[PDB]
Amino acid sequence: MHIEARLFEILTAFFALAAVVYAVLTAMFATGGVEWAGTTALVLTTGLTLITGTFFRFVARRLDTRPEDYEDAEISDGAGELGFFAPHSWWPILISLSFSTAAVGAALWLPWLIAAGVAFVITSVCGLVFEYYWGPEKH
Amino acid sequence: DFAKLAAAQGDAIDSRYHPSAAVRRQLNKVFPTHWSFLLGEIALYSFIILLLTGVWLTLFFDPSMAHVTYDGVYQPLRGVQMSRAYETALDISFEVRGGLFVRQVHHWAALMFAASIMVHLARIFFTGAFRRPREANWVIGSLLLILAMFEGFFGYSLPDDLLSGTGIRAALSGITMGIPVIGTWMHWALFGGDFPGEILIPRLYALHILLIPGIILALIGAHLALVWFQKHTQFPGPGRTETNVVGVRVMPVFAVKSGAFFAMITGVLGLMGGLLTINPIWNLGPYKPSQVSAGSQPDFYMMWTDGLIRLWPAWEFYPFGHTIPQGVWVAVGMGLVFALLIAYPFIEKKVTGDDAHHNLLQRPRDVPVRTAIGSMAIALYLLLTFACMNDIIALKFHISLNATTWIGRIGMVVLPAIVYFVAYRWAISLQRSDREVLEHGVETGIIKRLPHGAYVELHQPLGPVDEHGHPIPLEYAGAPLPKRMNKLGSGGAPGTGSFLFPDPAVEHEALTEAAHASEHKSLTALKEHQDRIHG
Amino acid sequence: LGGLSGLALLLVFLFWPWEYQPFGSEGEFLYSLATPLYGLTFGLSILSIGIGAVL
Amino acid sequence: MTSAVGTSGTAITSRVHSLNRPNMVSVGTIVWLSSELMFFAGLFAMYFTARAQAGGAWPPEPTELNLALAVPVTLVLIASSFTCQMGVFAAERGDVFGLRRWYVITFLMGLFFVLGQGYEYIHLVEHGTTIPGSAYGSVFYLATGFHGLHVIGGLVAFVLLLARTKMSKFTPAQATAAIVVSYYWHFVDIVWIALFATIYFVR
Amino acid sequence: QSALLRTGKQLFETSCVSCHGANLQGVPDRGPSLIGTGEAAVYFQVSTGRMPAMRGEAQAPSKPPHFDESQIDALGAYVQANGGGPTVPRDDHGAVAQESLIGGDVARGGDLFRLNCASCHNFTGKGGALSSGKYAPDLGDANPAQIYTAMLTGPQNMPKFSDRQLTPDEKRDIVAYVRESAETPSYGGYGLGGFGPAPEGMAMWIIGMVAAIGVAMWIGSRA
Amino acid sequence: GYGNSLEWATSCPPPRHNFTELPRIRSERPAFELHYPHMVERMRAEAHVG
Amino acid sequence: IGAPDVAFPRLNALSFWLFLFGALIAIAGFITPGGAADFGWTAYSPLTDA
Amino acid sequence: ELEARRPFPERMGPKGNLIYKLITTTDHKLIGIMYCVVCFAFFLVGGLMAL
Amino acid sequence: MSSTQDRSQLDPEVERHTGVDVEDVPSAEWGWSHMPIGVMHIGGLLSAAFLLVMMRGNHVGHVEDWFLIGFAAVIVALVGRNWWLRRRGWIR
Ligand code: HEA
Ligand SMILES: CCCCCCCCCCCCCCCC(=O)O[C@H](COC(=O)CCCCCCC[C@@H](C)CCCCCCCCC)COP(=O)(O)O[C@H]1[C@H](O)[C@H](O)[C@H](O)[C@@H](O)[C@@H]1O
Ligand SMILES: CCCCCCCCCCCCCCCC(=O)O[C@H](COC(=O)CCCCCCC[C@@H](C)CCCCCCCCC)COP(=O)(O)O[C@H]1[C@H](O)[C@H](O)[C@H](O)[C@@H](O)[C@@H]1O
Ligand SMILES: CCCCCCCC/C=C\CCCCCCCC(=O)OC[C@H](COP(=O)(O)OCCN)OC(=O)CCCCCCCCCCCCCCC
Ligand code: HEC
Ligand code: HEM
Ligand SMILES: CCc1nc2ccc(Cl)cn2c1C(=O)NCc1ccc(N2CCC(c3ccc(OC(F)(F)F)cc3)CC2)cc1
């Protein structure tokens, strides 16, 4: 987790530099000082990269070299129990349809449709989140 | 001494009468415990509520077209000529305490009655509950559904209303007048004259509070008697066969849950009658032949009729000095529709040839052709219903009214075909999912094989395992299969303390191994009964 | 809870500002949720009784 | 079906072993939170460009920010973040019940924050400022209301995850789910701290 | 007024000359002639925001006003001076009379509405669909003056109810009924729009059926 | 032929889960090294020359 | 990368479906009588206001 | 020494082996194929617009 | 582990020998699984004919007729492709 961390610290450094130079060169040499739109966007994309890179560096320090992060690693080194990978599920399409219902209720100003879409989204997200935890029916 | 009193009353009843044998026989009757089998109950429950509400409404409703000035509380209709029926509907809404609530829950119960009948019909159709033992049931049920629809029409038509009045004008007057040979004669008999005939609303009142509810009650009695004595069908399962009913006896369990379901359905209907406004007739002035509204729909169970009117392309025929109006078409439509609904099991047995006594239901996926046909019928019904709402759909969802009309026109031919194809392939795909889970077992998380980098989903066999890893495939038996280890005994033992605090470890243990033993004993008993059936 | 809801239904039906109030008149708001309260209390009562029976 | 093909305690397990490998769900939620930061960046850009274009009195005369109720809600949000972190601490352990208690009180504090924000919204609305009324009113309401929608989503996640912990034996996967929900809540209240330092402090 | 007409001309010369000629005669196949439309037409059309139309389609929709009350009056006075036509009602002060346009009678206003307005709008003033891409918008938003001017000038596919069909008394009565229906709470719970059968059936099939089927699934088993 | 990327080291219609046999990844282009072992050394030798 | 699947594969299925239906609703501007979005792709502000 | 292979691989596969997969498939490869097919559907919709 | 295999004796009744086979439809015996291709093609032709005949009505516009023509042509093309493939034995 060190290489993909360093990637994000490099991106964070560049974005911080770009935001700082934009702010300095717009606060003066511009008609209305700092643009306040590009400046904030650059600052918070710097923040985006900073959060991701900080988490990656934290994990990398927390983690011993993984086989994937280790050169000269045999395939048998990584062999073993991989985690749960969700098999077939029809809940994603229902979530998409629910959000589409809410989106059309938003575009077409139909507050009833917005509410129905929000209810559908909550129901479908519950179904997805609970899909692999719903215990057997007890009768 | 309540125990002694109960014993004495039982002895009196069994001394005067001798129902011990019969009473035991019904109290022991077994009813399957599938949720879908409760669907029909909803309709019955809704029906009961309607009766209980309907009688109440009869104590305050005066059916008549006698013109009168309101002179009542509702200011926006004062001095306006209205039929006495509309005046009394307004009085119920405003003048009698709870009258708005009572008629509101009555109309909501009518809508739930219709919708639950439709859902029950779909259930029995897709599950094939109409086969050899129970065609007559189907048939009467079909008739029953039809009656409900018409009574609903006669229900919101009772309060002489602009919306309901224009609905009467379109449907009854126009269509009856359109029928070629006797159409005008039927119109004059039904109205005792032309459309505004002064004997329409009283006749509809008689048909709606006395005649049609009585016929529906008689048909419901026949329906429930047949289901009771043609003991309910069941889905395939472990210990379930064509010659037994696996479930819960009537008295301890089935009666309690049925009564609780009636209570909860009544609660849903009361909550709707309070919080949701149904047919706000006061906004709808008294019916006048000239006044109009843009919406002008009937209740959802006749929206398919209205949509069929809208989408049918204005085709008329003109014989020798006679006219055959386009309205005629819808009548024929209904005929065919009903003629195909009432008769369907006989067409099914004539085409397929299944003339066997079928007691085990069929999963809809296991009958791709019938599932596709039912999906096609539901698609056509939905298309027609939304076509009736094409006015409102265009208003809210910005689509040109002509565009919606032509979408419906092309759809009533194309959408059924697409839905049939999709439903057929979907049913076969569900069958293949079942076969795959049988032949491989349930799926789980992925693991990377030790020596090489093979990735395997780490299945779970549902049956005996071969000498090597792969199991012996099982044989499909028409019962649902577990596609998720979720629903098996995997990761399903949360702390039984409480939501906030635990219980002592000894108590949690006792409870969890008790539940484990109970469910294992249930499985063992079902398996032993299954083996004893054949073996 | 079903019992308290039934008692609330009795109390609201006996003592609540029902009756049509002309648009704009003070107390129209109380009327506007009179029938909603009737239905709410009745439905909660019977629904909760049914829920208790099912449980 | 001798005993089992997959010798796993639960049908659902951690998507990667968190001991020697990164918690993959944690990485995914961190990435998504980093993106939602840039969404809030769009909102902040709107507000800031509106601020630059005022005639020296950025909150119009009709609008008068109710700091008396605004400070308490921020305090409640940071307290909810602390209790969420306590819920996480309980989650790393097998103590599902402590996790549930901590997350329930966090949910209550977040709901109280939402209720207080609604109260302040109605107070501002009755005294003039509204979305269709003024540029300040519109930008303020838009930013704070999208944050409030995020808070409501966090409350939804809290209730859903408590229910999920109720329906299965508390697994390391459930602990990771609780941890990612806590990450989302921490993002939510951090964004609120920024929105308070801008809307109410910097003005 | 001289300054009012000057301001109206200034606003007109740079907002609508493209659709309507500089002499207010409609540009062919872009916009109609504004000669004789009147101050009432301008007020209703611009206060509702329709007039900076920005497209030629089946139905010009309502949108936020592009001019403020004073500018609305300036444009309306300009048009009134050019052609001469209906004028927006005004009270003693001089502003666009809105409170004074609420007729006392509502039952008579209700009959007038149902005979004339409900034909396409609704029983209770909601919207309605029209032939091809057109519709009748909801009356909830329109203020009394806007309703009055809409009746007094049929914007597009609206019958123009002259002062002789609906005398100021009848127009005020209809305005009163419209406002009363729009602002009156739906007695008997949340009024699902104004259309009965369609929202009512949809709400049945969603709320009641989902609840009943979910309760059946809870009570019943699966197999 | 002469592919890279580890994507051509699995049955051309890839099995569910993408692999039944994973090569010992030694460079950017494991599939080429698997299918052409003799070039492995060459790949390491001529690489730097450019 | 030699992986069996994507990190959150239900999530990528959700992404695909969210795309399909979002694109469908965006394109559905054409069925409306007014038509689809007339403002340029870039959709600069005042031209996009109500 | 010789393998028993079909003369030509299955062209289409058995009826109804795809619809439920599309509805439920969690396999990334199938989702990518769906992406490509839908994306060219859209690339024709656009492009016809261009024509 | 809480589950048990099920077996069902279902009354079987045509003798499910002509039409569909379990390989094509895994639950052929369990219920109606075959709709003849003849009724397919006849219904498709009837749908196309209905689409054409709706061109005759009361509508001055012609976008509607063109959409009808396009949809009916699509249906006829699908039915023709299916019929040709069936006649040749699902080739091309
Ligand atoms: C990926 C992006 C992309 C692609 C591939 C193309 C491809 C093409 N574009 Fe592009 N174009 C843009 C992106 C793209 N364009 C953008 C972003 C703009 C600016 C938009 C704006 O100003 O807002 C633009 C603008 C633009 C204009 C200016 C229009 C205007 O603003 O006035 C023109 C004019 O000819 C044009 C032409 C073309 C042509 C002739 C092609 C050809 O390459 C297209 C190839 C054609 C096809 C592939 C169709 C063939 C298929 C069929 C006939 C089958 C159809 C069947 C069904 C639909 C069932 N484009
Ligand atoms: C469950 C329902 C599913 C739908 C089922 C049906 C599917 C079949 C679709 C058939 C499409 C047919 C479209 C043709 C229609 C047509 O013929 O009309 C035209 C207008 O074309 C159009 O809009 C194209 C519309 C195409 C959109 C169809 C999209 C499918 C949607 C509906 C699917 C979503 C379903 C979601 C359901 C929700 C769940 C349900 C439980 C022109 O009218 P007009 O407007 O008057 O134009 C005048 C000129 O005439 C005149 O010359 C010119 O001069 C002008 O004046 C002009 O005005
Ligand atoms: C078990 C049943 C539980 C039911 C919940 C009961 C809720 C009780 C609500 C409170 C008491 C009754 C309110 C009666 C007062 C009242 O009616 O409520 C209107 C609101 O109405 C709307 O707009 C909709 C607003 C969106 C929120 C409500 C949505 C609730 C839906 C989702 C519940 C039913 C299910 C439908 C699902 C359908 C989805 C299908 C997938 C509010 O006024 P307003 O907003 O201004 O209405 C405009 C006039 O002004 C103006 O003139 C007029 O012309 C109009 O423009 C009018 O809209
Ligand atoms: C996308 C949503 C639509 C577009 C984006 C909107 C984003 C806004 C987000 C949060 C703000 C909510 C806080 C609302 C409370 C703040 C107070 C206020 O807004 O001001 C009062 C005004 C009247 O002002 P007035 O006429 O001058 O009369 C003054 C009376 N004396 O009410 C209003 O219109 C406010 C109503 C706003 C409701 C927004 C509902 C959002 C839920 C959408 C669900 C997700 C859809 C998915 C789409 C992909
Ligand atoms: C279908 C014929 C028709 C009838 C008759 C009719 N309307 Fe309309 N109405 C329309 C149309 C179309 C519009 C759209 C106006 C526009 O687009 O400029 C409209 C618009 C309106 C508006 C504007 C509301 C807004 O928010 O823009 C009001 C108010 C109104 N009508 C009230 C009435 C009244 C009052 C009557 C009875 C005198 C009536 N209508 C009769 C069709 C009609
Ligand atoms: C059996 C199925 C029934 C259905 C589907 C049904 C349906 C309806 C509907 C939808 C209404 C409209 C109410 C309104 O809009 O206010 C209505 C009205 C009415 N119903 Fe029925 N009903 C049924 C049974 C009954 C029964 C048994 C009675 C009498 C015991 C009855 C008496 C009435 C009366 C008097 C009215 C008019 C009163 C009013 O509208 O306020 N109904 N019916
Ligand atoms: C029309 C559509 C409609 N538009 C609107 C607009 C607004 C509103 Cl609010 C409601 N609507 C509706 C509406 O609700 N329609 C329901 C409806 C339709 C037809 C009938 N029909 C019974 C049988 C008759 C008949 C047929 C054959 C006969 O021959 C026999 F059987 F052999 F004797 C005898 C009589 C025809 C009328 C009932 C209800």
Secondary structure of chain A in HEC code, one letter for each residue: CCHHHHHHHHHHHHHHHHHHHHHHHHHCCCCCCCCCCHHHHHHHHHHHHHHHHHHHHHHHHHCCCCCCCCCCCCHHHHCEECCCCCCCCCHHHHHHHHHHHHHHHHHCCCHHHHHHHHHHHHHHHHHHHCCCCCCCCCC
Residue bearing the CA closest to ligand 2, atom 23: G31
| Chain I residue with Cα closest to B464 | I5
Q: Which domain holds residue A56?
A: 1-139
Contacts within 8 Å (CB) and 24+ apart, E206-209:
E206/A116, E207/B268, E207/B272, E207/B276, E208/B108, E208/B111, E208/B112, E208/B115, E208/B268, E208/B269, E208/B272, E209/B112, E209/B115, E209/B116, E209/B119
Between CA H44 and CA D200 the distance in angstroms is 51
The two tokens of residue F14 are 């890839």
- Separation CA G23–CA G31 (nearest Å): 14
Per the CB < 8 A criterion, the answer to whether G23 and H42 are in contact is yes
Q: In angstroms, rounded to a whole number, what is the distance separating the alpha carbons of residues B532 and C7?
A: 54
> What's CA B480's distance to the chain center, in Å?
23
Spatial separation of the C-alpha atoms in residues B78 and B285, rounded to whole Å: 11
Alpha-carbon Rg of chain A, whole angstroms? 24
Helices (H) and strands (E) in chain B, counts: 18, 6
Distance CA B74, CA D76 (A): 50
- Which residue of B160, B173, B305, B332 sits with most ligand 7 atoms within 8 Å of its CB, as the best mutation to test the pocket? B305
Residue E116 Cα distances to B323, E158, E173, angstroms: 32, 11, 13
Residue type for D160, please? L
Q: Which of B404, B395, B402 is nearest to I59 (CA)?
A: B402
Q: How far apart are CA E183 and CA E163, in angstroms?
A: 26
Residue D14 lies in a domain: no
Ligand approaching nearest to the C-alpha of B303: 7
Domain assignment present for B437: no
What residue type is B362 in one-letter code? Q
Cα first-last separation, chain H: 57
Structural domain boundaries enclosing D183? 24-200
Q: Whose structure tokens read 């009843």? A: B13
Helix axes D96-126, D67-92, angle to 10 degrees: 160
Q: For a pocket test of ligand 2, which of B310, B406, B421, B422 has the largest count of ligand atoms closer than 8 A to its C-beta?
A: B406
Report yes or no: F14 and H33 within 8 Å, Cβ to Cβ. no
d(CA E203, CA E197): 10
Q: Would residue B46 count as lying in a domain?
A: yes
Ligand of minimum distance to the alpha carbon of B331: 7
Q: Which residues pair with B249 in a beta bridge?
A: B30
The DSSP result for chain D, as a single string, is: --S-SS--SSSS--SS-TTTS--HHHHHHHHHHHHHHHHHHHHHHHHHHHHHTSSS-SS-SS----HHHHHHHHHHHHHHHHHHHHHHHHHHTT-HHHHHHHHHHHHHHHHHHHHHHHHHHHHHHHTS--TTT-HHHHHHHHHHHHHHHHHHHHHHHHHHHHHHHHSS---HHHHHHHHHHHHHHHHHHHHHHHHHIIIIII-
Find all residues with CB under 8 Å of C52, minimum gap 6, and list them: C1, C2
The reply to whether I52 touches chain H by the CB within 8 Å rule is: no
Report d(CA B45, CA B269) in Å as an integer: 10
B417, I50, I57, I74 from I44: Cα distances, Å: 8, 10, 22, 10
In chain B, the N- to C-terminal Cα span, in Å, equals 51
Dihedral sign computed on CA atoms, order B485, B486, B487, B490 = positive
How many domains does one find in chain A? 1
> And the tokens for H16?
């109804």
d(CA I64, CA B311): 13
Size of chain C in residues: 55
Cα torsion through B305, B307, B308, B313, rounded to 10? 150
Separation between Cα atoms, residue D166 and residue B483, nearest integer Å: 22
Chain centroid offset of residue E84 CA: 22
Element (H, E) at I80: helix I63-88
Integer angstrom CA distances of residue C46 from B101, B437, C3, C5, E189:
16, 43, 9, 8, 19
Tokens standing for residue B145:
């559904």
Q: Is the C-beta atom of E118 inside 6 A of ligand 5?
A: no
Solving technique:
cryo-EM
Q: Output the ligand 1 site: residues, CB below 6 A.
A: G 40-41; H 43-45, 47-48, 50-51
Residues 6 or more apart in contact with residue E59 via CB below 8 angstroms: E130, E133, E134, E135, E156, E157, G33, G34
Q: Is B288 inside a domain boundary?
A: yes
Helix (H, G, I), strand (E, B) or coil at B360: strand
DSSP E82: H
CA distance B475 to B249: 30
Three-state SS across C15-30?
A: CCCCCCCCCCCCCHHH
> Cα-flanking dihedrals φ and ψ of residue B234, to 5°?
-145, 160
**C-alpha D138 to ligand 4 mean position (Å):** 9
Residue E91 structure tokens = 């009270």
Map tokens 């009837």 to a residue: I46
Report how many domains make up chain D: 1
CATH of the domain at D172: 1.20.120.80
Close Cβ partners of B347 (under 8 Å, ≥ 6 residues apart): B340
Report the CATH number at residue B419: 1.20.810.10
Q: Which residues of C8-20 are buried (b: 16+ CB within 10 A; e: fewer)?
A: bbeebbeebebeb
User: For residues B401 and B387, what is the distance between their CA atoms, to the nearest angstrom?
Assistant: 10
Residue D138 CA to residue D134 CA, distance in Å, equals 6
| Per-residue exposure over D54-86, b if at least 16 CB sit within 10 Å of its own CB, e if not | eeeebbbeebebbeeebeebbebbebbbebbeb
Helix axes D172-196, D135-166, angle to 10 degrees: 160
What are φ and ψ of residue B331, in 5° steps?
A: -55, -55
User: Which of I9, I48, I52 has the alpha carbon at shortest distance from I30?
Assistant: I9
Phi, psi angle pair for F18, to nearest 5°: 75, -10
Positions of chain breaks in chain H, given as the residue before each break (C to N > 2.5 Å): none
Residue B234's DSSP bridge partners are B360
**DSSP assignment letter at F15:** P
> Under 8 Å CB-to-CB from E214, ≥6 apart: which residues?
none
Of B427, B431, B409, the residue nearest B419 (C-alpha): B427
Chain B contact for I18, CB < 8 A? no
Of G12, G23, G27, the CB nearest to H31: G12
Alpha helices, DSSP H, located in F1-50: 30-35, 37-46
Q: From the CA atom positions of chain D, what is the Rg in Å? A: 20
Residues whose CB is less than 8 angstroms from the CB of residue I24 and which lie 6 or more positions away in sequence, other chains included: B428, H14, H15
CB F30 within 8 A of CB F21: no
Give distance in angstroms: CA of F43 to centre of ligand 7: 84
Question: Residue B422: what residue type?
Answer: V
Contact present, D151 and D188 (Cβ < 8 Å): yes
Helix runs in B292-400, H state only: 300-311, 327-352, 368-388, 390-396
Instruction: Please answer whether residues B174 and B156 qualify as being in contact, where contact means their C-beta atoms are separated by less than 8 angstroms.
Output: no
Q: What is the CA radius of gyration of chain H?
A: 17
Side-chain-side CA neighbours of residue B367 (13 Å) = 20
Quote the DSSP letter at residue B442: B
E16 is an annotated ligand-binding site residue: yes
From the CA of B142, how far away is ligand 6's center (Å)? 21
DSSP three-state, residue C6: helix
Number of residues that make up chain F: 50
| Residue in B93, B97, B95 with CA at minimum distance from that of residue B72 | B95
Please indicate if any CB of chain E lies within 8 Å of the CB of C36: yes
Going B90 to B95 to B98 to B99, the CA torsion angle's sign is negative
Among the listed residues B477, B474, B447, B475, the one whose alpha carbon sits nearest the alpha carbon of residue B459? B447
Q: Which amino acid is at B423?
A: A
> What string of DSSP letters covers E152-217?
HS--SSS----TTTS-HHHHHHHHHHHHHHHHS--SSSB--SS-SHHHHHHHIIIIIHHHHHHHHH
Three-class secondary structure of residue F50 per DSSP: coil
| Rounded alpha-carbon distances, angstroms, from residue E160 to D176, E37, E113, E149, E150 | 68, 11, 14, 10, 8
Q: Domain limits at B80?
A: 2-430
CA distances from B504 to B157, B509, D93, D102 (A): 64, 9, 18, 21
Token output for B309: 């009117």
> Would you give the DSSP letter of residue B35?
G
Question: Which tokens belong to B371?
Answer: 């599932």
Contact between residue A132 and residue D167 where contact means Cβ atoms under 8 Å apart: no
- Rounded to whole angstroms, the Cα distance separating D153 from D114 reads 11
The one-letter amino acid code at B227 reads V
DSSP B445-471: --EE-SSS--EE---B-SSPBPSSSSB
**Which residue, A137, B56, B119, is CA-closest to E208?**
B119
> How many angstroms separate the CA atoms of I57 and B235, rounded?
49
Q: What is the sign, positive or negative, of the torsion defined by CA atoms of B322, B324, B327, B333?
A: positive
